[PDB]
């Protein structure tokens, strides 16, 4: 079956509610559901379900002219009415979308005709179009599949307009998609895609080696990285490594001793040998990160000063702040209190554990005692939400989220970044400026605001950037070159052409 492929994912795709989150998987929501406008690698959007649009002079009122030839996979029409009902369904659950500022900005959505859709905003919101382009929540399910005229309490069949249709799903076993033969756009070359549920990275590698699957596609956690390197030399296989898509880092709790001290956070940022970490734990497959956002990220080329690995500097900073070594001890003390920091991570994640152990070792070398707290996923996310951590592994979100959406979410208290930043004297100013940068259209001011926000976060040593990570691919050669999608969390299956 040349036009059928089998791949893997750590979990099922979920029920494919276009408007909800976990356990829904974003790449799968994007396979079935489509946006008004589609995100492009150059940062722009192109017409998609909307073929054109205009906006008022004040930038608060937008009118979209929709395609008139689009049907949902069940034959029902896509029109402005269906689109408007979707926006209502999403914003009826507005509290759940607080992280996404567009969901707080939309004041009204109404269908003016079958082809005219009008959206009104609280303010001129500059990332409007890019947030419409996201995998979720502003994509469109057939309104017939609402449950009692809503989606927040569940849907019936996951009926979208997209190039893929969910055929069937088996909890903890597999998901099967097929090509939408009545798609309004270009027909995918692939006719059927099977996702085998395989939570363990080694088991995924083994599944490929045995031929049980044709394709592996994911971030640095896709498979063991030593194994990936071996595969990249195996002439029976094909492998790919993308240019970096996002940052992996530690978040340091500015509201909790001892990471509440700037001098301590600064020292920690000099203590880790990132190159060695990446060569030791990531098998040399990723890039060193010096800043929250790579210099290639929009608005983030700011000439921020890296803190290079320098244990001598780290020690000096701690000594100057009164953190000194007692006789016959390797761990520093101040006011009799030991320099002890808890590093929280998902205990079953081998890669995270490996990095955590390297970080612990590096920090012990400069007199800081890091305790490793490996816990189940739910417990770690709970800690993130309420700030019950000293240090935690964290990551940015990739295009088109970085930086505007990641920054926007820093304002949401139930979220790791707010919690990490909560102890900063300048946190209210930062949150004020984040609000301002999203709504200004003085472009000069926009750049200045981004500079100030990112520079304060950098100078305050809120994060310990570790790596800019890449997408990775392992595939049967017969599938050919595997494309990457403009949106980092999407998988462009319809672009695969064996
Ligand atoms: C992934 C990949 C890229 C960006 C995000 C950020 N998400 C922000 C919304 N999260 C909800 C969720 O992922 O269930 C926020 C959030 C809340 C609690 C814990 C994690 C996260 S996202 C890391 C976008 C989304 O999920 O649609 C991801 O979760
Ligand atoms: Cl420990
Ligand atoms: Fe999320």
UniProtKB/Swiss-Prot annotation:
Record bears the keyword Signal: yes
Domain of life per record: Bacteria
Gene Ontology biological process terms, A to Z: negative chemotaxis; nickel cation import across plasma membrane; nickel cation transport; peptide transport
Matches recorded under PROSITE patterns: SBP_BACTERIAL_5 (PS01040)
Keyword terms: Nickel, Periplasm, Signal, Transport
Protein name (record): Nickel-binding periplasmic protein
Pfam family, one: SBP_bac_5
Family membership: Belongs to the bacterial solute-binding protein 5 family.
Organism from which the protein derives: Escherichia coli (strain K12)
Subcellular location: Periplasm
Keyword hit for ATP-binding: no
GN (gene name): nikA
Gene3D superfamilies, per database record: Dipeptide-binding Protein, Domain 3 (3.10.105.10), Periplasmic binding protein-like II (3.40.190.10)
Gene Ontology MF term list: heme binding; metal cluster binding; nickel cation binding; peptide transmembrane transporter activity; transition metal ion binding
GO cellular component: ATP-binding cassette (ABC) transporter complex, substrate-binding subunit-containing; membrane; outer membrane-bounded periplasmic space; periplasmic space
SUPFAM superfamilies named in the record: Periplasmic binding protein-like II
Job of this protein: Involved in a nickel transport system, probably represents the nickel binder.
